[PDB]
Amino acid sequence: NLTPLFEELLQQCPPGGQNKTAHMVSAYQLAQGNWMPTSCHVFMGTISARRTKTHPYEAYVKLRELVEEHKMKTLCPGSSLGKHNDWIIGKIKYQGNLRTKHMLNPGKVAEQHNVYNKTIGSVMTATGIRLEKLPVVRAQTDTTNFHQAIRDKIDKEENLQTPGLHKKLMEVFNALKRPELESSYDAVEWEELERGINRKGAAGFFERKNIGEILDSEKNKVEEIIDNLKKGRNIKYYETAIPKNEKRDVNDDWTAGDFVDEKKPRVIQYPEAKTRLAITKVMYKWVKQKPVVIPGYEGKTPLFQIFDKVKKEWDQFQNPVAVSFDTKAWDTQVTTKDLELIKDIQKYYFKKKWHKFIDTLTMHMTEVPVICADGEVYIRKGQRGSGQPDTSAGNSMLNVLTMVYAFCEATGVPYKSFDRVAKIHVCGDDGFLITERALGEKFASKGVQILYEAGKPQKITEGDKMKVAYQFDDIEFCSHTPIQVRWSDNTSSYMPGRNTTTILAKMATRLDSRGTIAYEKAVAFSFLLMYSWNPLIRRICLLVLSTELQVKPGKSTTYYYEGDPISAYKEVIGHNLFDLKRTSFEKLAKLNLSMSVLGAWTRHTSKRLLQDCVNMGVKEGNWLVNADRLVSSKTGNRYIPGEGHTLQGR
């Protein structure tokens, strides 16, 4: 009768190991009665008890008491600052006001805009879209709330994990390794590194130069860092903490969409540019996943291809479901033991000569001095700094390993049999697995407690059950969800869907210090490659791309086109924009609801936007807008593309 109160309490219990020498009882058995708990240390949702004719509610107060004693005995031990971190105390000037209760705040070192895209935003307002009703995106955070986010998210002890967990995860990894690559990775040349790197990658708190300036002038400083790490010598490793969307919140690398920024923590933490180059030059093959050795890693997968790729798998099951990975604030849940596990996997693939390098870097990452923009210093215990070069690889491998383990331990499938039973996909902590429905439902109901014990608590959901998709287009991944379209050649395919209100908001605004038609047409094109299923988005893009046919698109955003944008679309999408005859009617109604709830459009909006495209397309000539099938069928005019190619930006 009171079994949900016990499932709750078992998620506040310290994770323990298998006690095969006493009775290990589930939350169900406890809600029955005549079971008296003898310790609060939980293992696969079970604790140690002895039958002793006790009332069920009596046994709850005892578990609650054992939990409350255990917490007031592991409070907050003042931890020894490692010697290799001592230098930061030598930079302290004033005393701290972070008021951290779980990490050292050893003081404070000396002190050291959302705007509209004018053309895109005009096209929206002309057809009656109310911009001030759209959701705000890319919000900045002041210093008072910045320090509060530190206190809320970062200022915590390392998660307790199941004893022996990381040996199991290494067992899972042994079922997934690629032995033809073992001990084979070496550092890359400067030239290869310089190809794939944003030269405006941010400088650390004590750095003045950005990535490109350091490449042009201080390569010796980077090789000096590499040398010291190679031999096992400490470096002055620190990370800098800035709020999301700050000036220094810059991606070293091309991102597959704005969803990567959306998923960043509120507190961004990154090593120095010199230090980031050092790690990247040596660990390139691992951090960039070249080749991909993480199963199901979609980090390199274009957003316009991902769901077609997944549907292929979904079709091979006889009753597939998809179970979502939904860890709470993943980066704050990464433990020292997690990092050492990833250190061990890296050592598998890297040549022996880099193992001391990896050991020493990993040691620096387990206790990280972090300097805030305003000078406040805290000493982070474990966790992931979002700007670390290893964030995508290191999180993706840890996510895969932890999710396979949790799935296998809930269902009974041996680790070496996971690949005959389920398919997995990850982007850092984001992802899901597809499997047959009964396995999927099993995993979904037991995964929450197994994942809490493995140190990755899940977001608190309706009945402590992991989210299950029972139809393909209910999957969520990379902030998007599948939507089917119909082409004029009697085929169908999937595109990345999301709320129309969200797309408008992201398309309409930017953070700027770059505000010009060149940038906006690059945005319009980048969005057309993803959202051409959405007729409102499709037509705003065509209108924007019709502006100043002689100005070329900018290269600072996700994609751009060389030559004809309509032909560039067909190059990567595989059909002509003109061949899209139908978007799935049910899914589109779902993704359009918030337009009506927020009042971001009116009953005329679609008509006015269609009427604007028609008015432009009837005129004699060659008009981009006539690539829209319904516009062309009303103007009587077709568009004849010239040559054109899609490319990545920066």
Side-chain angles (χ1 to χ4, degrees), residues 199-220:
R199 297 170 48 83
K200 166 39 207 168
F205 176 93
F206 289 128
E207 249 168 356
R208 179 186 298 166
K209 299 176 161 172
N210 58 40
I211 289 278
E213 289 164 339
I214 283 148
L215 286 160
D216 302 337
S217 72
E218 291 193 8
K219 280 194 184 65
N220 63 303

Side-chain angles (χ1 to χ4, degrees), residues 526-561 563-598:
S526 295
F527 275 51
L528 178 76
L529 290 183
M530 310 301 173
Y531 305 122
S532 72
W533 54 268
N534 189 314
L536 193 125
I537 306 300
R538 191 177 56 231
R539 279 148 199 180
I540 301 169
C541 292
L542 294 174
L543 288 179
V544 174
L545 288 162
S546 295
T547 309
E548 298 178 38
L549 291 197
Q550 312 301 310
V551 180
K552 300 188 180 72
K555 302 173 192 58
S556 47
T557 195
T558 316
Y559 296 94
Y560 67 94
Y561 54 107
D564 196 290
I566 302 293
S567 267
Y569 169 110
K570 145 77 158 296
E571 166 189 52
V572 289
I573 289 317
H575 301 78
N576 285 299
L577 183 51
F578 183 80
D579 300 337
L580 206 161
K581 58 191 275 172
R582 207 152 62 232
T583 299
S584 159
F585 154 91
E586 298 87 348
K587 187 58 164 181
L588 181 58
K590 291 168 181 167
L591 297 175
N592 275 153
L593 168 72
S594 60
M595 294 294 290
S596 309
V597 176
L598 301 175

Side-chain angles (χ1 to χ4, degrees), residues 227-245:
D227 186 66
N228 275 326
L229 285 179
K230 202 169 174 251
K231 299 153 171 186
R233 303 188 193 110
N234 310 330
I235 50 170
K236 302 220 198 160
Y237 186 88
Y238 73 103
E239 286 173 12
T240 301
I242 70 193
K244 198 205 278 231
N245 304 311

